[PDB]
């Protein structure tokens, strides 16, 4: 339960290109810090470097919507890699089941554009239904927006813990 050493093990696996194992230990460190993601993970543990490493681990495993979810963990939301990852079609993750963990309206706008351009209308309807949510309104009061982001963050990281532990 030493998150510093868990991050060290995750990075050791990350350098050797064991991306599944690296993700395992990053999520283990996060679950040490926040009590199984019940609280916010401290920024001095899930730093932008750690989150970027997690992004690379998810991308190299073809879990592209998971890359899109992790892209809004960063202090400055990285839309370039998020949009690049969502363009991929060889996904090995649940895809449309993860659209409930996206709280950024820009990511969902791009998802709706992508599913409309590529012709999948039902997934496009799922993304539109996700945008058309009261708690998702970008013009909401701030404390509502962090609460939506925090609950989606908790659910997403717990789902990843279930998948990767």
């Amino acid at each position: 339960n030493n998150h510093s050493w868990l991050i060290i093990q995750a990075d050791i696996y990350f350098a050797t290109n064991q991306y599944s194992a690296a993700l395992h230990y990053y999520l283990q460190a996060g679950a040490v810090c926040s009590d199984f993601f019940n609280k916010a993970v401290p920024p001095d543990v899930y730093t932008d470097q750690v989150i970027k490493r997690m992004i690379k681990c998810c991308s190299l495993l073809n879990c592209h919507t998971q890359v899109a979810i992790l892209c809004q963990f960063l202090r400055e939301i990285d839309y370039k890699t998020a949009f690049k990852s969502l363009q991929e079609q060889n996904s090995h993750d649940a895809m449309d089941s993860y659209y409930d963990y996206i709280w950024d309206v820009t990511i969902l706008e791009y998802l709706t554009y992508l599913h409309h351009k590529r012709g999948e209308t039902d997934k496009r309807q799922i993304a539109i239904k996700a945008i058309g949510q009261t708690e998702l309104n970008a013009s909401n009061p701030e404390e509502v927006l962090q609460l939506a982001a925090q609950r989606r963050k908790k659910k997403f990281l717990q789902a990843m813990a279930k998948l990767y532990f």
Partner: protein, 544 residues
Amino acid sequence: MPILLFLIDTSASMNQRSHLGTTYLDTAKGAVETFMKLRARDPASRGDRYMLVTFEEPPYAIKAGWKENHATFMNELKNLQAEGLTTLGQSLRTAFDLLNLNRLVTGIDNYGQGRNPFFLEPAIIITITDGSKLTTTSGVQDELHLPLNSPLPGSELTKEPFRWDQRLFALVLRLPGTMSVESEQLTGVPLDDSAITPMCEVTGGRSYSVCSPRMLNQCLESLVQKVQSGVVINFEKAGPDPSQPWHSCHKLIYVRPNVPIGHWPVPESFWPDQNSPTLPPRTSHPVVKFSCTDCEPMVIDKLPFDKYELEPSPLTQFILERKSPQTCWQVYVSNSAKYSELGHPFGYLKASTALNCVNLFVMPYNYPVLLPLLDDLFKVHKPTLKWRQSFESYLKTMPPYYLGPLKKAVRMMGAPNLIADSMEYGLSYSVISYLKKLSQQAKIESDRVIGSVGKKVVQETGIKVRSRGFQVALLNKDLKPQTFRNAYDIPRRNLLDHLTRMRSNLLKSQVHSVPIAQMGNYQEYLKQVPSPLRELGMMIDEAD
């Protein structure tokens, strides 16, 4: 002859629900409905053409261009779908391209012959969007940039896509998901802080940070009050008055008709010459530098003076604060003299004695050295040779484009045989040939765009199956099923009953799916029916 172009944001971020339960696109369409409801109240607004542009791809972006009836505009507005990205810059470029498409063929934009406030094609672009960041396939652009990849012919002569008589307004819908009103909405409409605000400001318009339905109604009402004919002027301050907001102001100067009339163009920002293969690019808003100095508004008889009432602006606020109704402030333009760069005073801003309005009075290029001279000629009655050499001396300090209107005016006073009757145009033949080429190309591309607005092209219905060519079709509604002519359209569960039906139908012995618009039409139904023998709270409930 106004034009009302609506740049409806159709990015998928417009699918955000407000507390009303309707998406931002639904309130956007409703705001368009409210706008035409309010605009139609003015009985001088009867003659008015609406256009529609969206954020889609260029063939599909325009949905109501020129020569499209109001019914098509309504039908296209009702059926919009928010499914694209926030390509706001590209949509603004195509919106301005739509408006400035016909400018060259009819020559409203007089290039090198002066800027004519009386030659204008008024229009305003209302872009209803949200505050969401701009998006392209690459990423988030985070700043409004207007693409310049495929310039329209003649776009190099204006240097800015937006024209003299075009203004941009924005309805940035900030309606929150949860009901969060307060007394803060009771105050006036705020400005926005998004990327559409600076481009709105430089066009002479403004944005509207709307956050509530009542302030949406206020914003729409103010927008109806701002649909006015005229041209915008980038007023600049020169010299000290006896930071300030009058130092730089884009304000509207209204144009009144009775086909508006007028004679004196605003001077160009270059000295014309006959040895320039290419014309300089004039700015969209002609900078005028007013000298903060008291001056007399002297007026003479039988000569064209053009009055242009200003929009209520901080310039007018300054004028009323320093209430000096019987004096005037001189205005001039830089780069309008061969022997000087400061130019010469061609007009003056004189406050009305009642202090109701401030009006621009455009005169010939150097009016204090023509008006006494011409008034002397008209009061001294033959002309004198001293007057002739003085007239020639004026022509040395005079750009060529004023000569035509001055000769026209002098003809109107009743002395066509005066010295200015020689006539010319003072511009390069290369420029004139380039202008005819621009007119031809503008006409051809105008025809091409007007044809493309109807959208005779269509989208495919494939998936392009990969090999991790062949494609699986998508469902297409209103594809006209041929069930009675094609057995493949018959569902298996509905096979026997359909078989019985079309068996009976083939013998001696789908329908009722009319569109809802033509469903309660009793005028149309009775028109297609024979006549009988002749005799001896809410808004509507049908059949009046």
